[PDB]
Amino acid sequence: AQYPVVDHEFDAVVVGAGGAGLRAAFGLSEAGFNTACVTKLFPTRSHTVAAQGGINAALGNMEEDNWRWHFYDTVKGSDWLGDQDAIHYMTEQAPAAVVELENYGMPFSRTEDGKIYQRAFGGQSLKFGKGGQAHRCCCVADRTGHSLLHTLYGRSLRYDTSYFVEYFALDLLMENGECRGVIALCIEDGSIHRIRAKNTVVATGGYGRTYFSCTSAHTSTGDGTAMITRAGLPCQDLEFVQFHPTGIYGAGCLITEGCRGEGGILINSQGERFMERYAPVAKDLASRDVVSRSMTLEIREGRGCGPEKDHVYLQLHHLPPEQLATRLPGISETAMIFAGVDVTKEPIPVLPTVHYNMGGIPTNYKGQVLRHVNGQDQIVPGLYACGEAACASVHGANRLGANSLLDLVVFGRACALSIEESCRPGDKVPPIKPNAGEESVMNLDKLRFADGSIRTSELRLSMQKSMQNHAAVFRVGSVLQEGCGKISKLYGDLKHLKTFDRGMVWNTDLVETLELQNLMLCALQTIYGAEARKESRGAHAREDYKVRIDEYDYSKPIQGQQKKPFEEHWRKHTLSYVDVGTGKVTLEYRPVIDKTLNEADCATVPPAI
Amino acid sequence: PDDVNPVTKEKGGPRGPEPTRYGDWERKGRCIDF
Amino acid sequence: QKDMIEIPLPPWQERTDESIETKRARLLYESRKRGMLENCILLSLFAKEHLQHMTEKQLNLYDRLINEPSNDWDIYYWATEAKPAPEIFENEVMALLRDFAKNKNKEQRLRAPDLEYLFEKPR
Ligand SMILES: Cc1cc2nc3c(=O)[nH]c(=O)nc-3n(C[C@H](O)[C@H](O)[C@H](O)COP(=O)(O)OP(=O)(O)OC[C@H]3O[C@@H](n4cnc5c(N)ncnc54)[C@H](O)[C@@H]3O)c2cc1C
Ligand SMILES: [Cl-]
Ligand SMILES: [K+]
């Protein structure tokens, strides 16, 4: 058809209205920048609202604390894939960030003496791991994420932030190596909007829906990740995906390990408590990834449950119902609402479930998006990223609990501060070519009228199952290679898509097909990166490569060792690229940043084992 | 009293049982975070 | 809820500029695309059952129910019985949603539906 094209000019455009995007947009607008915020959802429907837990900051309200101890915990948790300059930045800023959020109106819970109440969480420690549990985790009642969104969205409006609500960003407007804005679809009326700006912030969230089981809202489709890929820019560490072992089958709702702490057990199709064979001491309270791998082996060997023999059972019905009702109030209701299960007589169907994407768009600690040219890091002019879509990398190979609301506010603010320090409101906005974005519109039109042999639903499910079966917790060469072939085959299937809705008013069919394209790019890079990485580090663990492969053997004194060349160890970030036309994946690597922002303020933590 | 936890005297915090009592963060048996 | 009292957001408005087909299509999107999986699943399934069959009055009641509240969790708790809904939401559509969430026939509500129900007949 014909596509009405509308042009806009802003100082800055933020793609995303979750915690990260709202913090960036509010920050820019408060600083005087004419700021647009493009979001495919009303802002409080962002997945940030799902966060009913907390946010870490070393306020020291319950004991003496030091943000440098939070730095240490985060570095160690990252398994030394985390960039220590970004982790320094984030943990040093967190105390002020949380107090600022309270000042903005977030009603953080309080101690009897008026301080922000804090909980132990995430394995956090005092005195660089030597001093017992730290209490850093702060919250707003049972709705920290919602409070964050409501507060930042509401405050942004006082500074005239311009929202494009239910607009779907299709691509970046790149010209000669610089970002000049974004091209987006108005979902309500089908018009195409080219939003020009001197600076663009990508804050689009995760890509959990590449898998069959994830905790994400159904909006988590990797759209900004894919825009980066389509610009020929690298994504980073996409193989590092954090899983929980006991999500409800299909739904992805995580069931608390408290069910197993109270005596719940995992059962296979033969009625066996199989965790006794994989973890004779810890049994069903073995570590997350041990449990997930054990479940997967059971399923792979034909002992999975259900009609497709593709999950296992979490059995609670041997426990006294009084115990369930008293110690786990609500588990009966949750299991009934989604699985239709009465936990006093039926098991819950469960399987390992994606919860967090450590990987994403590589940035420096300022939120500036990086390319990797001639083996050197180099910022992309006019382009920023923050939040779960980004890879700063504060989480490295494993995110700590309650650090993932923190990175939203720290790096959302960092993007705004970086723009404020390098630019002024009203600076000339770079022009774009009159046909800029044409290819995005061509792709949209092809999907709108797609009349092939594979429906969006069919390709989507096949992708999700293939990722679940080949690129989840259980990783080994032969299975990863099989999965690489499958995902490459499904990428080729995008050319055979079948859609149905040919209109342009609230065309959810079309939007979910764009989302599938984006997911498929993310899936390709995740599984090829995982196949290439022949080591175990944090959430990536391989049955054929069970050891963390660093530049030294850090299990032994370093004195007298020969350092391994960069190309012969794995303590390095994966960089992934896709030739969109052919589906060809290319991998490169860049070093982990071990230097902090200031060694005198915060010492680099050497890798340890 | 309405919004004050009788045990910890936390004000305006999570309702019902302590969400982190098992080490993760749970609500109604759902694991929110870990 | 101090932040929500001191920081009020733009109010929800019933829309009068939409054909019934447009309103149904918008509420489909806004049912499927929620901030947590719980309401993505429950509201996408509820929408499949009802949107194409509702009257305009029912659509407007549903619109207010799922789109006026700032917090998806408030809707989820109203529907699953953990909290009572404000009087503005006490009507037949809320009654339908509350009864649906109870899952009295112990069905599996584990996935949002594929969209073919809108376009193809079941063979
Ligand atoms: C169920 C759950 C519970 C969690 N609980 C906690 C917790 O207690 N504590 C914690 O620290 N972490 C928690 N996490 C992790 C943390 O909540 C998330 O990592 C974080 O909220 C992500 O925020 P974000 O701003 O990066 O993205 P999101 O909040 O996902 O927002 C992404 C934004 O991008 C927009 N967008 C996406 N694609 C497009 C497009 N194509 N066009 C336009 N706009 C687009 C969306 O509309 C949305 O506004 C939880 C995660 C989940 C899934
Ligand atoms: Cl053991
Ligand atoms: K990430």
PDB file of C-alpha atoms in Angstrom, chain A residues 40-41 44-47 49-50 52 104-105 107 143 146-147 150-151 153-154 157-158 166 187-188 215-218 248-253 336-340 345-346 455 457 460-461 500 505-506 508-509 512 515, chain C residues 1-4 7-10 15 18 22 25-26 28-30 32-38 40-42 66-73 76-77 80 101-103 106-112 114-116 119-120:
ATOM      1  CA  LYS A  40       5.070   0.016  22.302  1.00  0.00           C
ATOM      2  CA  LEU A  41       3.223  -0.034  25.660  1.00  0.00           C
ATOM      3  CA  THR A  44       3.365   1.255  33.501  1.00  0.00           C
ATOM      4  CA  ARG A  45       2.747  -1.909  31.411  1.00  0.00           C
ATOM      5  CA  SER A  46       6.482  -2.348  30.989  1.00  0.00           C
ATOM      6  CA  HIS A  47       7.940  -5.522  32.428  1.00  0.00           C
ATOM      7  CA  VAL A  49       6.074  -3.498  36.791  1.00  0.00           C
ATOM      8  CA  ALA A  50       6.506  -7.252  37.383  1.00  0.00           C
ATOM      9  CA  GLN A  52       7.674  -6.954  43.294  1.00  0.00           C
ATOM     10  CA  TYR A 104      11.016  11.876  43.908  1.00  0.00           C
ATOM     11  CA  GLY A 105       8.151  10.182  45.751  1.00  0.00           C
ATOM     12  CA  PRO A 107       7.581   5.396  49.368  1.00  0.00           C
ATOM     13  CA  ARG A 143       5.366  -2.986  44.167  1.00  0.00           C
ATOM     14  CA  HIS A 146       5.333  -0.235  39.682  1.00  0.00           C
ATOM     15  CA  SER A 147       6.301   2.601  42.056  1.00  0.00           C
ATOM     16  CA  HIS A 150       4.605   5.566  38.179  1.00  0.00           C
ATOM     17  CA  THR A 151       7.011   8.013  39.836  1.00  0.00           C
ATOM     18  CA  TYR A 153       6.575   8.591  34.290  1.00  0.00           C
ATOM     19  CA  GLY A 154       4.619  11.123  36.318  1.00  0.00           C
ATOM     20  CA  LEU A 157       5.425  14.762  32.361  1.00  0.00           C
ATOM     21  CA  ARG A 158       6.113  17.799  34.556  1.00  0.00           C
ATOM     22  CA  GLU A 166       1.845   2.238  21.466  1.00  0.00           C
ATOM     23  CA  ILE A 187       0.074   0.840  16.050  1.00  0.00           C
ATOM     24  CA  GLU A 188      -3.252   2.660  16.270  1.00  0.00           C
ATOM     25  CA  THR A 215       9.296 -15.130  33.338  1.00  0.00           C
ATOM     26  CA  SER A 216       8.954 -12.186  30.948  1.00  0.00           C
ATOM     27  CA  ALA A 217       5.810 -10.433  29.892  1.00  0.00           C
ATOM     28  CA  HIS A 218       4.849 -11.305  26.319  1.00  0.00           C
ATOM     29  CA  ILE A 248       5.316 -23.586  35.679  1.00  0.00           C
ATOM     30  CA  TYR A 249       5.261 -25.396  32.335  1.00  0.00           C
ATOM     31  CA  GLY A 250       4.346 -23.035  29.485  1.00  0.00           C
ATOM     32  CA  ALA A 251       3.370 -20.145  31.760  1.00  0.00           C
ATOM     33  CA  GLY A 252       6.883 -19.505  33.063  1.00  0.00           C
ATOM     34  CA  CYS A 253       5.654 -18.410  36.490  1.00  0.00           C
ATOM     35  CA  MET A 336      -4.794 -23.622  40.375  1.00  0.00           C
ATOM     36  CA  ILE A 337      -5.030 -20.345  38.446  1.00  0.00           C
ATOM     37  CA  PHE A 338      -2.504 -21.353  35.770  1.00  0.00           C
ATOM     38  CA  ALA A 339      -1.953 -25.097  35.821  1.00  0.00           C
ATOM     39  CA  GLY A 340      -5.419 -26.095  37.034  1.00  0.00           C
ATOM     40  CA  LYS A 345      -3.419 -34.186  45.265  1.00  0.00           C
ATOM     41  CA  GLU A 346      -1.648 -33.320  41.960  1.00  0.00           C
ATOM     42  CA  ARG A 455       2.085 -19.117  10.128  1.00  0.00           C
ATOM     43  CA  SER A 457       2.408 -19.007  15.445  1.00  0.00           C
ATOM     44  CA  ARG A 460       7.390 -18.905  16.886  1.00  0.00           C
ATOM     45  CA  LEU A 461       6.629 -22.110  18.749  1.00  0.00           C
ATOM     46  CA  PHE A 500      -3.775 -12.856   8.048  1.00  0.00           C
ATOM     47  CA  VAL A 505      -5.425  -0.320  12.519  1.00  0.00           C
ATOM     48  CA  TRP A 506      -4.297  -2.139  15.686  1.00  0.00           C
ATOM     49  CA  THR A 508      -1.564  -7.248  16.458  1.00  0.00           C
ATOM     50  CA  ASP A 509      -0.899 -10.022  13.901  1.00  0.00           C
ATOM     51  CA  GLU A 512       3.671 -10.051  16.742  1.00  0.00           C
ATOM     52  CA  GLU A 515       8.408  -9.321  17.184  1.00  0.00           C
TER      53      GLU A 515
ATOM     54  CA  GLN C   1       0.556   4.384  47.620  1.00  0.00           C
ATOM     55  CA  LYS C   2       1.815   7.869  48.519  1.00  0.00           C
ATOM     56  CA  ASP C   3       3.486   8.276  45.117  1.00  0.00           C
ATOM     57  CA  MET C   4       0.149   7.549  43.433  1.00  0.00           C
ATOM     58  CA  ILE C   7       1.767  12.091  41.475  1.00  0.00           C
ATOM     59  CA  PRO C   8      -1.529  11.622  39.592  1.00  0.00           C
ATOM     60  CA  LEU C   9      -1.281  10.462  35.972  1.00  0.00           C
ATOM     61  CA  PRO C  10      -3.486  11.577  33.053  1.00  0.00           C
ATOM     62  CA  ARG C  15     -13.327   6.659  23.797  1.00  0.00           C
ATOM     63  CA  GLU C  18     -13.727   4.217  17.625  1.00  0.00           C
ATOM     64  CA  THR C  22     -11.313  -0.686  16.062  1.00  0.00           C
ATOM     65  CA  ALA C  25      -8.694  -4.587  17.963  1.00  0.00           C
ATOM     66  CA  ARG C  26      -7.190  -2.100  20.405  1.00  0.00           C
ATOM     67  CA  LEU C  28      -6.917  -7.193  21.883  1.00  0.00           C
ATOM     68  CA  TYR C  29      -3.493  -5.595  21.785  1.00  0.00           C
ATOM     69  CA  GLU C  30      -3.945  -4.086  25.250  1.00  0.00           C
ATOM     70  CA  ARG C  32      -2.149  -9.427  25.219  1.00  0.00           C
ATOM     71  CA  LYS C  33       0.593  -6.880  25.992  1.00  0.00           C
ATOM     72  CA  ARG C  34       0.672  -6.499  29.804  1.00  0.00           C
ATOM     73  CA  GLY C  35       3.513  -5.937  32.248  1.00  0.00           C
ATOM     74  CA  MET C  36       3.651  -9.421  33.736  1.00  0.00           C
ATOM     75  CA  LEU C  37       3.015 -12.900  32.362  1.00  0.00           C
ATOM     76  CA  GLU C  38       0.091 -13.473  34.736  1.00  0.00           C
ATOM     77  CA  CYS C  40      -0.715 -11.483  29.621  1.00  0.00           C
ATOM     78  CA  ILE C  41      -2.026 -15.044  29.965  1.00  0.00           C
ATOM     79  CA  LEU C  42      -5.305 -14.397  31.773  1.00  0.00           C
ATOM     80  CA  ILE C  66      -7.943  -3.332  32.211  1.00  0.00           C
ATOM     81  CA  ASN C  67      -6.641   0.109  31.235  1.00  0.00           C
ATOM     82  CA  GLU C  68      -7.604   2.603  33.957  1.00  0.00           C
ATOM     83  CA  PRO C  69      -5.529   1.007  36.768  1.00  0.00           C
ATOM     84  CA  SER C  70      -1.878   2.067  36.781  1.00  0.00           C
ATOM     85  CA  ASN C  71      -0.751  -1.262  38.235  1.00  0.00           C
ATOM     86  CA  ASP C  72      -1.361  -4.605  36.522  1.00  0.00           C
ATOM     87  CA  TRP C  73      -1.028  -6.233  39.952  1.00  0.00           C
ATOM     88  CA  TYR C  76      -4.592  -9.494  38.991  1.00  0.00           C
ATOM     89  CA  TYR C  77      -5.441  -9.291  42.687  1.00  0.00           C
ATOM     90  CA  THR C  80      -7.905 -13.733  41.784  1.00  0.00           C
ATOM     91  CA  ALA C 101      -9.835 -16.556  37.069  1.00  0.00           C
ATOM     92  CA  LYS C 102     -11.175 -19.084  39.596  1.00  0.00           C
ATOM     93  CA  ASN C 103     -10.684 -21.791  36.915  1.00  0.00           C
ATOM     94  CA  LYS C 106      -9.310 -26.913  36.306  1.00  0.00           C
ATOM     95  CA  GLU C 107      -8.131 -26.039  32.816  1.00  0.00           C
ATOM     96  CA  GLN C 108      -4.593 -25.256  31.744  1.00  0.00           C
ATOM     97  CA  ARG C 109      -4.024 -21.510  31.280  1.00  0.00           C
ATOM     98  CA  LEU C 110      -0.385 -21.671  30.366  1.00  0.00           C
ATOM     99  CA  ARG C 111      -0.050 -19.738  27.104  1.00  0.00           C
ATOM    100  CA  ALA C 112      -1.558 -16.787  25.311  1.00  0.00           C
ATOM    101  CA  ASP C 114      -2.371 -18.001  18.873  1.00  0.00           C
ATOM    102  CA  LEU C 115      -4.298 -15.501  16.789  1.00  0.00           C
ATOM    103  CA  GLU C 116      -5.773 -17.919  14.222  1.00  0.00           C
ATOM    104  CA  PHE C 119      -9.244 -15.556  11.090  1.00  0.00           C
ATOM    105  CA  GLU C 120      -9.651 -19.292  10.427  1.00  0.00           C
TER     106      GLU C 120
END
